[model samples]
Every structure is written in structure tokens, then in C-alpha cells.
Target chain A: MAPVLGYWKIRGLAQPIRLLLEYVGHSYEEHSYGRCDGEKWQNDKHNLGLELPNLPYYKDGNFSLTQSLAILRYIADKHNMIGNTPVERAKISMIEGGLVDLRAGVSRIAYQETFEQLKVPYLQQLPSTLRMWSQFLGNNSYLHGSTPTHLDFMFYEALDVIRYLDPTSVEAFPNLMQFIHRIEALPNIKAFMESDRFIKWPLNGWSAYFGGGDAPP
Target chain B: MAPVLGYWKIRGLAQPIRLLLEYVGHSYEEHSYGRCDGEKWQNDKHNLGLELPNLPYYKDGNFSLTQSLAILRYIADKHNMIGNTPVERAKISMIEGGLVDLRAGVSRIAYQETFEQLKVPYLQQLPSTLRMWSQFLGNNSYLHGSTPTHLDFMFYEALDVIRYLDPTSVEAFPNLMQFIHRIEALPNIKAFMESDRFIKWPLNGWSAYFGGGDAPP
Candidate 1:
């Protein structure tokens, strides 16, 4: 038996954890809730009894954790993927934070009907990132050197979403594309990606918008 | 030379760094540019040459880093305030991300002129956080046990900002307020807070709001 991860039945924060687990050779029980089920989570979220309760909750034996980044960091730290030294850890954390910002940008385009309006400026503001990240992956395989780190999982996931949403959008950054492809092609990660355990959900949902929406199904 | 941090000549992301430096007895130079100096940053930002460069850049001993959360993690790690263990670090990072959310919440209330419209829902949402944070601080003097981790600096800064904007905003959570006061009265933090080095700026600045009205003076 593995730890249970509870999250919405969508590819949100839990996606990266699933990738990380695959990289580290660990199995986890996914407890994905419904996209149309609010009452279930409302009833279940509190019963987990986390220090500060939150979704993407991880529970194994007597240990439990919450918060996506926290869960990722814990898994990375436990699996020795937090980088080899303090400096490496700092750089990884830096890239992880950048990935969060980049993810936020893509999420902006994904959610809320603002893509057509915000696409130009949003993509316009991304060269500084693409140029640097591409160069970082220039001759090497990953961000921190030859091996993959927790940072790679995050960057891969964010880019994966954008790549699927608009494949041509990332064509300009070849090296970054290589970076994502490299992670996706990893033996374990590839296995998980091909497995039946992966859930394919709608990339965009307006359930949380509260724009006078209908109640959940 | 330890490291130089550059930012607008105001209490922004750099505030927690300044507080951390003081708390850990590490003194460094500060190159605070004025809020009215966009031309300066525009010319100088690219010269520094960081990946995905932006404000709140940290430079020290041949190492330069960008991004606020990453820089804070580095500073906390370099200064030995990350926490005693890996789990603690994850919890700290989790709290740090949560602090960013809280800061963003208050930032929405502060820097924008739209608070009158957002006021009702914003205040309504405060209790969700206040209760948890207040309870998080109930027994411990510092966040994550008593050693004063980097998480405390962030939580203190967020609460401090909200408390300043509206003294009564956090009144319902006395323990959270006490958490702020506890950090405020720290010997080094207090000295820095009262020192001439700390320059207070207007709570709301129009530098980031791109709705377009005025050029910086």
C-alpha cells in the first residue's frame, strides 16, 4: 500500500506529484474527486486532520502532508532530489518559483475566457524566460546538471500543459521542449504516462468562477 | 562582500530580507532605487542578466539570484534559518507560499482603488485564514516550533501589512497579531525597524498597475 493523495479529478497541483513519484520509484493511491462534486470535498477536506488542512493531501502510515509545493518538496527531499548541496537547492528552489510564475501565466490563459485578449501580451512577456531556460538546457539534460531534480518535474508539468494546449506555442524554445520531452520519456515517468492510472480531465473548467453558475451536477 | 539586494526604495519583497539579515546579524549593502525611477531599472535590469529577471534581485560573492520566494529561501538557507530539518523546510516553504497568497490578498486591497467593490468579499474571506493563522500561533511563540524559522518572517510581514492598512483587520485573531508583535520586538528586527536605514514608502504605489495613467516622476 502507498500513500493516498486526495485532489480534484483534474490535472492540477497533483500532476507534478504524480510525476515526482514516478521519477523516484514510488506508488501512490490517487483519491481524485469529481469535477462536479462539491459536497464530497466539503465533507472530506476537514476529516483529513492536517496541520493546516488543504487538498493534494498526502498520507502514508502515520505521516501526512498538505500544500502542493510542500508535498513536492517533502517528496524530493525524501528521495534526495532537492539537489546535492545548499547552493543547488537554492537554484532549484529559484527555478521552482519561476515555474510557478510561468504556470500562473499559462493558467491565466487556460482559465477565464481571457486567452484571446491576453495572449499577445502574455506571450510577448515570455521571451526573457524562454531564452534563459532554453540556454540552461542547452548542452545539458536538466536544469541542475545531468540528473533530474524536483525543479525539472515542475517545469516539465507547466510546459506540458502549454505544449498540449498549443503545441506551436513552445516551438520557439527548442531546448525547453527537449527538457520536457526528456522528462516525459524517462523510463518510470513514461510508464506512468502510459498507464491507466493517469486521469484525462478537461483542461479548463469554470466551476470556481461563480458567475451565477448552476449548482454542481 | 556578502550580497547586495536591489529593489524599489520601499518596503516590498525586500522587507523580509532586511528583517532576516538583521535577525541573523548579517549586514549587507542595499541599493534601493526610487519608485519613480523606471528608466533606471529598465536600463539596469537587463545588464544584471538574470534568468527571468525582475526586481528584488539578490547578489553576493559571485552569485546573483532573482525571484522573491527563491531569494528568500536562499537567504534563509544561507543564514541557517530554513529550519532544523527537511520536513521543517517543506513546512516553511508551504507557509511561505501561503504567505504570498495572503500578501497578494492584502495587495489587492491596498494597491488598487477597487477595494470598495472587493471589500465585502475580501473581509469575508479573512476569517478563513485568520482562524488558522491565529491557531497556528496559539501556543508557539514562533511558527514551526520556537526557533524562529523563515516562515515567521513571511507570516509576520503579511500580518504587519494588513494590520497597518487596517488595524482592526486582524483583530479577531489576537494570536496572529501577537505573532506580528513578537517579531516586531525582536532585538535585531526592532533595531532595523526603528533604524534610519528602513525607509517607509506610501502603502500603495502605482508602479505595477498598468491601467496606464502617469509616468514615474
Candidate 2:
């Protein structure tokens, strides 16, 4: 039997894990609950004694785990998505850390009004983050040595989220746009993005919220 | 020759790498630079070729790496700080992610007053992070499984920073206090903490600025 993964319908945090699972060609059932439909699933048999404090919980047989990043890493390691050597693995982790900071910063601006208020006055601070990422990606195709790893998936996820939230926000950085395009063009990613299962959510308008009137131009 | 680590004397973001080096009995030189000192060191000859634009840079021979957590993980892996199995390693990474979130939340509260102004009300809406961590620890002695992994050291480093920043804020969670003491009691850690290098930046008095004159009781 396939394991059951429960999370919000929106891809906000769960998309990376979903992408990792798909990348590894694993079969798992996704159980998405609506934001307002929380009460409906509270007493369901599958959720009895396994109610998560929040969404993005994965259950395989008897074992269950929370935290999206944790889930992604677990799935990645199981599928050998990490690099070969310890140094390589550490490099992957380091790059993931940088992506996390970028995602958090962008999220702060998109979700928190205070960050936008404080951020606009200091627009120059914005270029530092873009340039930092650009330098990290300098000349190299991947953040790690030569091959793509879990970090690449994570960076793609973050970029997709930002582009969905506000394309204009990231319009200033051309390299980042090209980076996102390169990742999206990957065979597995292109298939996943075009799949029907990817678009079955009310919050599918994530791009519209972020100022992208249409798909990637 | 030992690697040069550049960060503030305080146990802010750089404590984990320091602890990892000391725990492994690695012969590394410590350069206690204050915040102002860090700015001065940025332009020094040593930092000329640094790719990333931040501190907590480590140089061993000609190999230099930036990012504090990255450096810590690198040293830890070289010394076998990660567990033996892939599952065990993933567990460590998972716990590390949680710890990062916990520490970042506290750091945000300490450094940015905007959270207090706008996000303070939402703070009550969320459950206590320390309590959640304690519950996680209660399920297992250390973050990974039985033995202390790099995640344990990272947790200690983060808790130390939080306690240093605001003791009363963290004192409410007894399990975390116990965990802190347990980690501190590790033989290598105890000896290191007693050394002049660690004593110069004791955790208790570090948060006087934010905690309003009161120290850890």
C-alpha cells in the first residue's frame, strides 16, 4: 500500500517534498485538506490518533513524520539524492541553507506588510541577496560540485514560490529568472508542472497573488 | 597552522562551529573578533577570495568556506559527527532544520523589534516553540537516536544563544533547561566551557540587553 501524505492543498511548504517524491518516481497518496474544511477531517478514521498538529504530515504504515524539509531530506536520502562524499553532502546542505534564507526573506516581504514597509526604504539591501545567490551560482550549473542534488530541487521550489507570489518582485534579477527557467525545463519537473494533479487547488492562483498575471513569460 | 574563524565573541551564530571544533579536540586557532572587529576583518587580506559575502569563514590550507552552519557540518562530518547510517543522518538533518527554525525565531524576536510591534499578537497564537522541542526530545534522548549527533551540539549552541539573549523567555520550559544542562555536562563540553575561550562568552550574561538587566537564575 502506498503511504499517505497529508498537507494543505496549496504548495506553499509541501511542494518540495512532492517534487522530491515525483523526482524519485515514488508512488504515494496525497491527502489534501482545505483550510476551511479542517473540521471535516478531524474525526475521519485515517486521522484517528494520528492527527497532526498541523499539515504536511507523512505516514508510512505505522511511522509518521512532520516537517516538510525533514520529509524532503528523508525522501532524498532514501533515493540517494544527496551527493557522494561528506564534503559534497555538506555543500548541498550549505546551498540549501542559502536558499532557505532567500525564501524566508522573500516570504517576509510577500506575507508580512511590515517587512515591505521596512524593505522599500532600503531597496539597495535587495541587490545584495540577489548578487549573493548569483555569486553562489557563478559559472557552475548546480550549487554543488557538478551534479544536481536535493538542493537544486529546493532552490527551484523557492524560486517558483516567489515567482508565484510576485514576479515583479524578482524581475530586477535576470540571472535568477534564467536559473528558474533552467530548472523548470528539466524533464521530470516539466512533466510534473504540466500534470493535472499539480493544479487541483483553490490557491492555485499563487502566481496571481504575487503579480504574475499569466504563466512565466 | 589552524583555521581562522571570524565571528563575534558572543555565542550568536558562530557557537556551533566553535563547539564542534572543541568537542573533536581539533587544533584550531580562535580569533575572538567583536561585531566591529568582524567589519574590519572583512576587508583584510584573508577574506579577499571568499565567494560568499558573509562571516564565519574558515580557512584550512587553501580551502576556505563561509557560512557558520556549513562550516560546522563540514568539521562535524570530517570528525564523524553525523551518524553511521543514512536514516540516522537524515534524522540529524531533520532535527537541525527544526533547531534552525527555533533559533531563527528567537533571533528575529531579539534583533528585530517589528515582530514585537506587529507579530507579537500572533506569537501567542502559536504554541511555545521550546515546549515543542522538549516534547521532541522526550521522545528520544538526543535528536537523532541514542547517542549525541551533530544535531545535539547544534541544539545546545542554539539554546545557549537564546538563554544568553533572554533567560526568562526560555526559562519557562523546564525540559529544555534539563536538556541544556545535560549537554553542558558532557565531558568534552564541560572541559571546553571551563576553558578561557568559552568562559569569555558565557551564555547567561549575554542577553542583558534584551532581557532587561535580569540574568539567568
Candidate 3:
């Protein structure tokens, strides 16, 4: 049996994991719950063989797991996408940590009732944030090198979400924009993006103010 | 010179790193910034040889890093405290991911103007949250086994903060309470906690409503 990845119907935290899975050409199944299916997810949440049953779970063989980053790392380690050297891994961890912080700010606004109100200030700070990321990216094609690491997937999702919110915001960073295009240009990723399994909307859940559209069956 | 760990004088994100360092008996200096010293930190933040400079930065030899978890993992990897097995490492990652989520909630309340008002609802869900952690813990002495992992340092600080918020809240879970004691009972940790270097109060910045008391000189 193929490994199973469980998550909400929306992208949210699962998209990077999805992207990484596709990038590595790994075969897996998804258990996606809909916006109105909280009760459904609740019923199966505890029965998934997961030690910490939460969305964005991965079950391979007898092993079960949760937490999006953990799941991503698990998949990345298997594909040797973590990093090649100690310093490189440390750099990956630094960027991964930054993405978590970045995701928090984005998640806060996306889910809040005052998303519109909070967005102005968020955008106000967006350029400086992107500037740091651009500086971090510098001349590298990916975070570390031309070869993609797990950080690239995580980073691409973060920038893509911001681009979704305001396209021009990401336009200012040429390197970031190029990086996004670079990720999209991946053979497997490009295929997956065009495939039926790809999801582009409802970046958050039903309760969110924006990107909370109903899931497709 | 020994490695230097820099952050606000508050425990906020750096305590776990501090705990992990002590647990492993590593020597390191601290460059703690004060509440009124944002400019002081700013002056050093970019010049510290960090690629993506931020608070809770660690400098060891020629290697420089930010992000608390990354720093902790770098230290943990050196001492062989990450995990002994693949499954154990996966579980550690799961718990570590959960801690990030848990910390966000605590941080939201601590920093908000409505902290007192929000505390009630936060505490309302606190038990069930702790319940899962307790269940995941089961009979293990630490997160993985009798030996400690980086996850233990992170978990100990999370529970300790909640214990500070309301001692009885954590006391309700005997296993969690025992875990707390077990962590506190570690010789190095116990001694460090009793030492003047341990800053229990001011868990956050001066802007925060709770746990934001002025740092000691």
C-alpha cells in the first residue's frame, strides 16, 4: 500500500508537503476533509493510527506521523533533500524557522475576522520582510544552491501565498520572483501543478475571512 | 571565547536553548538585551555574522545561527540528543511542531491587550491540550525514553510557563506534573534554575500585558 497523507481539502499547511512529495516523484494518497466536515475529521482524527493525530499526517507502513514540518522532513530525509553538509543543514533550519514565523503572521490575518483591517499593516511590513528573504537568497538559485532543498518548497509556498494575496508585493523581489518561477518550472512540480490533484484556492479553512472558499469534491 | 547566546533578558524563546545547553553542560556566554534596549539589539543584530539575524542568536566558533529551534537542534545534534531511532526522531519532531502551535497561543494571550479576557478561553482548552501531551508521553521517562532529547527542553518550558500562569492547571495531569518535576530534578537544570542566571519573570517583552515585567539589570 502507498503511504497516505491526510489533511484538509484546502492547501494550508499541506501544500508544501504536497509540493515536496511531488518534487521527489513519491506516490502517496491524501485523506482530505472538507470545510463543513469538522465532525467527520473529528471522528477519524483519533483513529488514523497517528500518535499525534492532526492534519497533514503521513502514514507509511506501520509508522504514523503528524505535524506538517515533521512530515515534510520525514519525506525530505528519505529523498536526501534535507541538506548535504552540517552548515547547509543549519542554514536550512534557520530558513525553516523563519518560514514558521512568516506563516504565523500570514495565518493570523487569513483566519481573523479583521483580515482586511489587519492586512494594511501586514503589507506595510511585507517589503522589508521580502527584502530580508531576497538578501538571504542573493545569487543562489535555490536557498543553498541550484539543487532544491526542503526549504525551497516551504519558502515557495510562503511567497506564493503572499503573491496570492497581493501579486505586486512579490514582484518587487526579482530573486524571489525568479525563485518562485524556478520552483514552478520543476518537471514533476509543473506536472503536479497542472494535474487534477493540485489545489489553488481556499488557502485557509472555512472559518477564515479570506481564501476560505468551499472545497471541491 | 565560548559560544554566545543572544536574546532579550526574558525567557520567551531562549529558555529552552538555555536549558538544553545546561543539560549538556556546554559552556556559553549570553548577550542579553534589555526591554529599553531595542536599539542596542538592533545595533548588534545585523553585525553578529548571522545570515538572517534575529533574536536568540547563537554563535559557536565560526558558525552563527538564529531561530531558537535551529540553535537548539544544532546544540542537540552535537551531544547526540536528537534521538536514537528514526521513529523516535519522528516523534520528537511531532512534539516539537506541537510546541510551536502551543507557544503561539500562549504568546497571543501574553502579548494581547485582552490578555486577562483571553486567558479564560485559553485556559478552557488548556486541559484537553495537556491531555494529548500526557497521553503521547505515556510511561516514557522523557520524550523518547529514559534519556532526554531536545524535545524535552522545549516541552519543559511550555509546561512551566502554563504552570506559572496557573499552577493548578498543569497539576491536574499527574504525568505532566511528574514530567515537570523530572525535568526540574535534573542536577544541572535544578542548579541553573536556582542560580541568579535563571530569569523566571518577564517571560515576554515590555509590550506584552502579562509576563512582561521590566528585566533586572
Whole-model Cα lDDT per candidate?
Answer: 0.73, 0.66, 0.84
| Residue B158 in candidate 3, Cα distance off native in Å | 0.9
Where in model 3 is the C-alpha error above 4 Å?
Answer: A215-217, B84-86, B215-217
Local accuracy of candidate 1 as per-residue lDDT tens digits, A58-166: 8887777787888999888887777656677777777787778767666655545555667678767667666766776677888776687777888887777666645
**Candidates, ranked, TM-score:** 3, 1, 2
lDDT (10s digit) by residue, model 3, range A4-74: 99888887888999999898878999878877789998898788787776888899999988898888888
Name the weakest run of 10 consecutive residues (lDDT summed) in model 2 chain B.
B204-213
Residues B1-217 of candidate 3 have per-residue lDDT tens digits of 8999999988889989999999899999999887778899878976888888788899988889989888988888777665555666666678889987767668888877888899999989888888888998998888766798778888998888788788898899899999999999999999999998998877767677777777432
Give the C-alpha miss distance for residue B172 in model 2, angstroms: 6.6
TM-score of 3: 0.95
List fnat per candidate, in order.
Answer: 0.61, 0.47, 0.55
Write candidate 1's Cα lDDT for B54-124 as tens digits.
78888887677878877777877876766667777777767776777777776655545665667678777
What's the CA error at residue A55 for candidate 1, in Å?
A: 2.1
Q: Identify the leading candidate in terms of TM-score.
A: 3
Across B14-79, the per-residue lDDT of candidate 2 in tens digits comes to: 777777778777788866665346457656634446666466677777766676777888887887
**Per-candidate DockQ vs. reference:** 0.62, 0.40, 0.63
**Best model per DockQ:** 3
